[PDB]
């Protein structure tokens, strides 16, 4: 139903034999050409392994076509992968303050695992 | 939408790699377990063979770009129309 | 690294162990030039400018006007065409993709149930291990509170 | 069922009221050859 | 802009309407004169069969380059898309099992701390007696 590259509903799909995964017949045939692997699973594809397989209602108000549809295709792919990019940049920095706690509680449970293993044995230690 | 072994409208579709048309889970698989093929295009098809990004739907940059071809091929053939004549 | 979550059943206690962690914390301190234009019209955030023939509203200006508005006419026939077979079918092809965005849907929402359920499988599995450890620790912990007073009364 | 060579332009926004003004043209070299 | 017979420019492209090659009109003359037959396939064909000379006709010898162009400049935004994404939920899985494990450890060491504390006031009181 969708294509698994760009996020699309292709009208002609195609599938691979390798991963079962629908894509666009343009958009798998291209990362075929570019780096010559089947993309999802990182297996061996070419052009010809892959085998082949949606209704559009125009609007009423269809120079709508010319100004109206044609900027904001163009205008809600680049403040989305523009807003994509801040994503990515913010969560290397929440993944880096992640790592960081986590090595700073180890340290915790290592010093705490040698005061109460210790500090019980000296409860055995005092009834002699 | 629907199956090309029955015309019911399928509720688990699987799609499999040797003729990929839509069926239904329990009706290929039953094919399939009478001879190992598909009955589409009688290719050798196993129940094995048989099965990130966020999407929106197919609207009216896909479906804009594919548009103009619809319109300007057509106003093509108002050219040849009006050459001929 | 063991820590039951769903025996031990205090947030001050959570604020009790983030200091600690944080005093711990506290010591250890491909595309071509449409890149480009792409990422700077995102930046400046201003949306480009576009001119229309029927904004200016002007007729009869000079020449180069008179040649502007033919291109009004053949637009509109062809918008007329374009409304023509729009209105031929006008419910049906509207319809066909409704049903359409009804299978697509029911997919994702099969997809809900199909993780909710192997979630709750992991959860299931978990909890009988959280209850068989407290078990088991609490024998040691029995045991634990006897030899303390054993040796004791022994001396 | 039966030479190829892709266009290169030149070296993004410009493109885009390029396109226009060859919609805008087409339509009037269409036109022209209508009423004659 | 090739012949497939001998590999020279095609000043006359011709085609046989058994298998679509161009051929050359000099070339393929002599190919059928021959053997009455197609060199692509070796199926039957005869010399009036031939596509002779070009078709330009009410044709009228731009427009369409720049639909394609945009075909093609889309192709590279929508393959950026994919591995972009990629690059996102690698991390939020990175990112949430982080967390969650540091979250889990923060439990390890309330557990411990109050169980410092109780080995500590016990020692304080035997000690004492």
Not at chain 3, 121 to 135: A, G, H, K, L, P
């Amino acid at each position: 139903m969708l294509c698994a590259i760009s996020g699309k509903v292709p009208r002609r799909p195609v599938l691979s034999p390798k991963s079962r995964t629908i894509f666009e017949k343009s958009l798998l045939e291209q990362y075929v050409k570019d780096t010559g692997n089947d993309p999802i699973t990182n297996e061996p594809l070419s052009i010809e392994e892959i085998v082949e397989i949606a209704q559009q209602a125009s609007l009423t108000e269809s120079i709508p076509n010319l100004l109206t549809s044609l900027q904001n295709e163009w205008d809600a792919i680049m403040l989305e992968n523009f807003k994509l990019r801040s994503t990515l940049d913010s969560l290397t920095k929440k993944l880096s303050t992640v790592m960081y706690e986590r090595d700073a509680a180890k340290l915790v449970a290592a010093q705490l695992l040698m005061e109460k293993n210790e500090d019980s044995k000296d409860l055995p230690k005092s009834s002699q | 939408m629907l199956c090309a072994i029955s015309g019911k409208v399928p509720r688990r579709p699987v799609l499999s790699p040797k003729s990929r048309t839509i069926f239904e889970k329990s009706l290929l698989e039953q094919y399939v377990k009478d001879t190992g093929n598909d009955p589409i295009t009688n290719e050798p098809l196993s129940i094995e063979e048989i099965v990130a990004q966020q999407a929106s739907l197919t609207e009216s940059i896909p479906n804009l770009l594919t548009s103009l071809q619809n319109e300007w091929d057509a106003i093509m053939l108002e050219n040849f129309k009006l050459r001929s004549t | 690294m063991d820590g039951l979550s769903f025996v031990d059943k205090p947030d001050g206690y959570k604020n009790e162990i983030d200091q600690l962690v944080k005093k711990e914390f506290a010591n250890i301190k491909a595309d071509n030039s449409v890149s480009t234009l792409t990422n700077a019209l995102y930046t400046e955030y201003l949306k480009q400018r576009n001119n229309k023939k029927r904004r200016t509203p002007d007729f009869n200006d000079d020449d180069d006007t008179l040649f502007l508005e033919e291109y009004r006419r053949k637009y509109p026939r062809i918008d007329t065409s374009r409304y023509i077979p729009n209105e031929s079918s006008e419910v049906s092809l509207l319809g066909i993709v409704d049903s359409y965005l009804k299978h697509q849907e029911i997919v994702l929402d099969t997809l809900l149930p199909q993780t909710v359920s192997n979630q709750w499988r992991i959860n299931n599995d978990y909890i009988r291990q959280t209850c068989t450890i407290v078990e088991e620790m609490n024998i040691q912990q029995r045991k634990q509170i006897n030899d303390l007073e054993i040796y004791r009364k022994r001396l | 069922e039966i030479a190829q060579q892709a266009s290169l332009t030149e070296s993004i926004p410009n493109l885009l009221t390029s396109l226009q003004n060859e919609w805008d043209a087409i339509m009037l070299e269409n036109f022209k050859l209508r009423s004659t």
